[PDB]
Design a protein around this ligand. Structure first.
Ligand code: HEM
Ligand SMILES: C[C@@H](c1ncncc1F)[C@](O)(Cn1cncn1)c1ccc(F)cc1F
Ligand SMILES: OC[C@H]1O[C@@H](O)[C@H](O)[C@@H](O)[C@@H]1O
Length: 527
């Protein structure tokens, strides 16, 4: 008889419940910790799963090392396990596929296999608002990208360039950080100046003069508050009863209400032209099933596009200034190109002359190689996926992670990858280009293959549509900085390390450079 063993099981359960509170709590942490380690050992035997990085603290996983030094985390994992490995991250299992085969696996994954929106909806919907980007089916997103891409034409860039130039010169004249009419040298924190210059130039060109005008008021404080809600904490705490979350929600309503006010005003007066992205979305925002975007969804889409382009672009111009501050040779080279292309400054900068400035564009390209703003791109796995040429199966409910920025820093693909060298792009200054066949997901033909080791703008259905706007904006900014200023580091200082815990891989603050006017007697006119 072993029914006596079943009696003692019941007896033991009854004695378990009688344990004093110090031991029941002690067991409350001892039991999961022990079972978590037991489970990892058994998992390591599965031949149809990638290796899983070992971790001590249940639920948390490798969150700390990944959050603070992700590329160092990937490099060590890659040496132990190779290019495919999983790790636990705050309750999720992330499967990483490093290198160009991983770009192909994740960026070209089938629509039914993976979902970006299920990975990101909690990050962006609380900031942007409902009904756009990740708060909608993929076919809706594909068409929103088509709508936005319709204000981003060559002829739009031709009119944006003088407007962006005006904003940069205004900033040089009026900002406390410069005041070029009264100061000939000064010190700036580039993580103060670049977010400001970026919002001013992106507002004037994409949003128009009215929304730019609002940035000269206390309304600008709403942008700061909404900006602060764009943070990785939303992956864990998207809504908490705190002032941070309520200033964010207030800003989203106030800002989108301001966009809707302008929109309803324009169509009240039939004042709908071809000036900015607001006009474009007012004329071209009907989905292919006949449904029109509402004014709320148009406003939420403007917020999302401006907020993403704000963070990637401002981080990138910060890094450009920081790399050039220790490279007066590159500043000199760029300056000579400006004098040649613009006939000593007697030519006005135009979008077409921007295309004749290869070294300037290679500097943006090289900065995006060394500082990809988004160190990791996620998808949630919706159907079990077989990893080709392996026995691995990534089950549904995992997440896949692709990191083109990690491959950007591999000597195998970019010799001396940790050295900033714009000439590695000689005869190849295009922001990107399809090396062969093309495909259309809804917003234009893009490269069909995504195995290039350089992918600053991603690829596949979720590929960036802001690339040409970003180059135009960054090119005008840097053209004007180069012609107007020389700059260098305070003594002893150098390029700062990246801060990987924020939404983009921005420089660790404070990152100060000292500027000096090239022409101390140059005056910037206007009121
Ligand atoms: C240096 C500047 C930029 C970089 C490096 C960059 C990079 C990227 C990358 C890597 C993706 C792919 C995301 C993924 O696969 O999960 C992406 C998507 C996207 N980006 Fe950008 N971007 C930049 C600027 C901009 C600008 C200026 C805009 C808007 C004008 C913009 C709008 C978008 C949009 C709408 C998507 C589509 C997201 C999706 O389909 O899921 N980006 N970008
Ligand atoms: C989802 C978000 C993101 N994805 C991954 N890691 C960090 C991130 F912030 C992002 O891809 C960033 N981004 C890309 N180009 C500009 N911004 C994004 C895309 C479209 C958008 F309308 C707004 C937006 F924030
Ligand atoms: O001239 C083409 C124009 O297309 C419109 O839809 C956009 O609003 C403008 O940004 C662009 O300049």
């Amino acid at each position: 008889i072993v029914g006596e063993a079943l009696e003692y099981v019941n007896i033991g359960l009854s004695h378990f419940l009688a344990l004093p509170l110090a031991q029941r709590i002690s067991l409350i942490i001892i039991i999961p910790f022990i079972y978590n380690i037991v489970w990892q050992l058994l998992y390591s035997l599965r031949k149809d799963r990638p290796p899983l990085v070992f971790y001590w603290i249940p639920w948390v996983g490798s969150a700390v090392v990944y959050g603070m030094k992700p590329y160092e985390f990937f490099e060590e994992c890659q040496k132990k396990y190779g290019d495919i490995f999983s790790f636990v991250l705050l309750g999720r299992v992330m499967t990483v596929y490093l290198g160009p085969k991983g770009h192909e696996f994740v960026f070209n994954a089938k629509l039914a296999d993976v979902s970006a929106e299920a990975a990101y909806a909690h990050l962006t919907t609380p900031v942007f608002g409902k009904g756009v980007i990740h708060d909608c089916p993929n076919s809706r997103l594909m068409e929103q990208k088509k709508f936005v891409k319709g204000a981003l034409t060559k002829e739009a860039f031709k009119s944006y360039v003088p407007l962006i130039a005006e904003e940069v010169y205004k900033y040089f004249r009026d900002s406390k950080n410069f005041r070029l009419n009264e100061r000939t040298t000064g010190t700036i924190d580039v993580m103060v100046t670049q977010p400001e210059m970026t919002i001013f130039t992106a507002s004037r060109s994409l949003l128009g003069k009215e929304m730019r005008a609002k940035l000269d008021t206390d309304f600008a404080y709403l942008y700061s508050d909404l900006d602060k809600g764009f943070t990785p904490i939303n992956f864990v705490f998207p809504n908490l009863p705190l002032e941070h979350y309520r200033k964010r929600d207030h800003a989203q309503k106030a800002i989108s209400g301001t966009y809707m006010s302008l929109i309803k005003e324009r169509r009240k007066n039939n004042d709908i032209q071809d000036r900015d992205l607001i006009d474009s979305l007012m004329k071209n925002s009907t989905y292919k099933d006949g449904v029109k975007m509402t004014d709320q969804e148009i406003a939420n889409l403007l917020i999302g596009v401006l907020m993403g382009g704000q963070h990637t672009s401002a981080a990138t111009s910060a890094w450009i200034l920081l790399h050039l501050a220790e490279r007066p040779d590159v500043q000199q080279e760029l300056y000579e190109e400006q004098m040649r292309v613009l006939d000593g400054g007697k030519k006005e900068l135009t979008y077409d002359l921007l295309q004749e400035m290869p070294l300037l564009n290679q500097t943006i390209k090289e900065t995006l190689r060394m500082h990809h703003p988004l160190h990791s791109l996620f998808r949630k796995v919706m159907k079990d996926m077989h990893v080709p040429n392996t026995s691995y199966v990534i089950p549904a409910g995992y997440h896949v992670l692709v990191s083109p920025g990690y491959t950007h820093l591999r000597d195998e693909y970019f010799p001396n990858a940790h050295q900033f060298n714009i000439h590695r792009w000689n005869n190849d200054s295009a922001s990107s280009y399809s090396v062969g066949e093309e495909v259309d997901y809804g917003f234009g033909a893009i490269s069909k293959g995504v195995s290039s080791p350089y992918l600053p703008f991603g690829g596949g259905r979720h590929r960036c549509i802001g690339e040409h706007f970003a180059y135009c904006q960054l090119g005008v900014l840097m053209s004007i900085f180069i012609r107007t200023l020389k700059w260098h580091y305070p003594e002893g200082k150098t390029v700062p390390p990246p801060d990987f815990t924020s939404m983009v891989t921005l420089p660790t603050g404070p990152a100060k450079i000292i500027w000096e006017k090239r022409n101390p007697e140059q005056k910037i006119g206007g009121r």
